[PDB]
């Protein structure tokens, strides 16, 4: 009886592959061969945010495009001001092993999470100035790799037990689950309209979910190794994925196909961080070669190189208006490119 | 009239840096140790002689250690093992002997030892429950390890009283299995410290402490190297 289900799944995979091939009318390179490119785009370091001891795992620009947050492996959540280079708070984390941070869009809360299988949420706006923990969301059975804020009362978390979750912060209970991934899920990225989202896992696959249902809309495959970081195209009808195969890939939500692939022979390391510019023309990748690249997302040319880090660079970030490019690395040094 | 606001911000930076100095001084006096144990291998019996993560703290020779008993996590470890590349030592507990447990532990060791980020973190190997070997060999491993037939104990053997030479041979055989990987894979940046731990002996703590010494000292001797 199980062989019937295997052959049904094989026939459905064959027909969706046939549909995807039939939708393939041309190549993005074939459509953009007549474009006017921009050449090399050099960038220069502006700041250096020292004060971390251990390696930095995460950073989230604030909606005001001025503040930063950073989680390091020494137990520190440090809330930076990227303009005057001043630390605003130094939250001591109860568990030193955290792999992600998140700055709420209303600036009222900061969420961290890690190997404790618990998402902690600290209330920035307090009566004493010594910011204590507000809510500890527990229930996950695997480590937390990514987490993002929808508002001050709905947070989307990505855990290592292969299930994503949508939590209501005020009551602590998880309102929505997201099952379907076989391996654990590395990175989340909410849609620009916060009605969909997408999650890449360690199966060379990503899944487009609708938060208003809790249901897997679409499933995109085409990578060959674990998918590390994910980021939407600023429009909201595409996104980009960096994976452990040393090759970025730009997917589209409507064509349901791998649309573009960026790679180079000299690259053999993973892709620990991906983000977009304000216009969406530049694709900002952070590799394990201890240097970042910027790609021309329409012509796949290496638009430039961003060096200045010695250890691993493990997180990237572009402001909500596109005036700076902060990086957080494994040598306790945030930096800013402009 | 923004100058006084920047003054307040500078005071809030000053106090935070005065806290971060004390935290940097309490973080360098703390050495972190990742405790990895296998299925039948006694991680918790290495704990006894001394959520998704558990924390044990050590005060020895007026020095503070941290041991991370990584518990209720996922079985596939290729994504959370990269967190522990800054710890001083990976305390690697192994069994000594129903599936192929020794080969599983040896393949886990070969995997960890060859990682791109763990190529600097040293390992401290333990071979637990040698009493199990002493009561199982005197009362079979050739099917899982044929070389055990054509193996003889080295001259460097340190046989404690009461152990049959066959059990000692099996013990040092497993030790040499691990040490072949230890020597062949790396390139002189980390070192495995085998330690034939018993069922219960508190001396294990010292065997940690002293070995951490060797892990630190040689790192200091990386600056003074030439050519």
């Amino acid at each position, epitope marked *: 009886e199980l062989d019937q289900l295997r052959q049904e799944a094989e026939q459905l995979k064959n027909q969706i592959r046939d549909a995807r091939k039939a939708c393939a009318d041309a190549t993005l390179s074939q459509i953009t061969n007549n474009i006017d490119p921009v050449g090399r785009i050099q960038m220069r370091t502006r700041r250096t945010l020292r004060g971390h001891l251990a390696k930095i795992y995460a950073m989230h620009w604030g909606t005001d495009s001025r503040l930063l947050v950073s989680a390091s492996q020494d137990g520190k959540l440090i809330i930076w001001d990227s303009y005057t280079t001043n630390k605003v708070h130094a939250i001591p984390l109860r568990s030193s092993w955290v792999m992600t941070c998140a700055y709420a869009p209303s600036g009222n809360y900061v969420a961290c999470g890690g190997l404790d299988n618990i998402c902690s949420i600290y209330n920035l706006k307090t009566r004493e100035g010594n910011v204590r923990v507000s809510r500890e969301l527990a229930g996950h059975t695997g480590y937390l790799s990514c987490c993002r804020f929808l508002d001050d009362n709905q947070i989307v978390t990505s855990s290592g037990d292969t299930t994503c979750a949508l939590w209501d912060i005020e009551t602590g209970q998880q309102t929505t689950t997201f099952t379907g991934h076989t391996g654990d899920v590395m990175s989340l990225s909410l849609a620009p309209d916060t009605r969909l989202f997408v999650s890449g896992a360690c199966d060379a696959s990503a899944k487009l979910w609708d938060v208003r249902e809790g249901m897997c809309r679409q499933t995109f495959t085409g990578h060959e190794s674990d998918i590390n970081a994910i980021c939407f195209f600023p429009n909201g009808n595409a996104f980009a994925t960096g994976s452990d195969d040393a090759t970025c890939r730009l997917f589209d939500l409507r064509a349901d196909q791998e649309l573009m692939t960026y790679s180079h022979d000299n690259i053999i390391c993973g892709i620990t961080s991906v983000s977009f510019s304000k216009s969406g023309r530049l694709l900002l990748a952070g590799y394990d070669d201890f240097n970042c690249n910027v790609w021309d997302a329409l012509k796949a040319d290496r638009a430039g190189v961003l060096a200045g880090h010695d250890n691993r660079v493990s997180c990237l970030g572009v402001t909500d208006d596109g005036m700076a490019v902060a990086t957080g690395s494994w040598d306790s040094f945030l930096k800013i490119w402009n | 009239d923004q100058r006084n606001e920047e003054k307040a911000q500078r005071e809030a930076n000053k106090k935070i840096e005065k806290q971060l100095q004390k935290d940097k001084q309490v973080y360098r006096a703390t050495h972190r140790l990742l405790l990895l144990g296998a299925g039948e291998s006694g991680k918790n019996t290495i704990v006894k002689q001394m959520s998704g993560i558990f924390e044990t703290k050590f005060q020895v020779d007026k020095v503070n250690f941290h041991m991370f008993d990584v518990g209720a996590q996922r*079985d596939e470890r290729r994504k959370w093992i990269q967190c522990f590349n800054d710890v001083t030592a990976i305390i690697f507990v192994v069994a000594s002997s129903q599936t192929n447990r020794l080969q599983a532990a040896l393949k886990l060791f070969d995997s960890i030892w*060859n990682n*791109k980020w763990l190529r600097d973190t040293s390992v401290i190997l333990f071979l637990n429950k040698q009493d199990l070997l002493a009561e199982k060999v005197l009362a079979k491993i050739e099917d899982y390890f044929p070389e055990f037939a054509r193996y003889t104990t080295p001259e460097d053997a340190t046989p404690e009283p009461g152990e049959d030479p066959r059990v000692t041979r099996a013990k040092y055989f497993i030790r040499d299995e691990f040490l072949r990987i230890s020597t062949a894979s790396g390139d002189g940046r980390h070192y495995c410290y085998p330690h034939f731990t018993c069922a219960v002996d508190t001396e294990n703590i010292r065997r940690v402490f002293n070995d951490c010494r060797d892990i630190i000292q040689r790192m200091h001797l990386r600056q003074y190297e030439l050519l």
Partner: nanobody
Framework: QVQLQESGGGLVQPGGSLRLSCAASGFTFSNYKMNWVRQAPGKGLEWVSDISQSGASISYTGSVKGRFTISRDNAKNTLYLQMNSLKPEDTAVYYC?????????????????????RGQGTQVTV
């Protein structure tokens, strides 16, 4: 996608000599180490054999040293396990697993929980 399919299993008398082939499509075969593992009915997953990017670093478990043999081809992207001088211990389903990264020496692909790049297997019995 990634596809790891197998062919050659079944039932053979004690002392037979089988050859399980594994076709690996979807990815680049010239970059990933390739493993062969087994699953016994009353036992968990066990590792059987390995082979490197060029095939130089062959390995075996103690119960198959000399008996089995691993091989692979790059023009056809195929992975064979030629099993010689079998025995009733060989009754197991053989999976054709893939190392989770390119240009790496180490792999974690013997996971009881569903490993991503692991084939569906072929059952051999004696």
């Amino acid at each position: 996608q990634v596809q790891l399919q197998e062919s050659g299993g079944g039932l053979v008398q004690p002392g037979g000599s089988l050859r399980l082939s594994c076709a690996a499509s979807g990815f680049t075969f010239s970059n990933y180490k390739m493993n062969w593992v087994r699953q016994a009915p009353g036992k968990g997953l066990e590792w059987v054999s390995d082979i490197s990017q060029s095939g130089a670093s062959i390995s075996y478990t103690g119960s198959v040293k000399g008996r089995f043999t691993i091989s692979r081809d790059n023009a056809k992207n195929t992975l064979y396990l030629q099993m010689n001088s079998l025995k009733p211990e060989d009754t197991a389903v053989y999976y054709c697993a893939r190392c989770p990264a390119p240009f790496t020496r180490d792999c974690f692909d013997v996971t009881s929980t569903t490993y991503a790049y692991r084939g569906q297997g072929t059952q051999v019995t004696v």
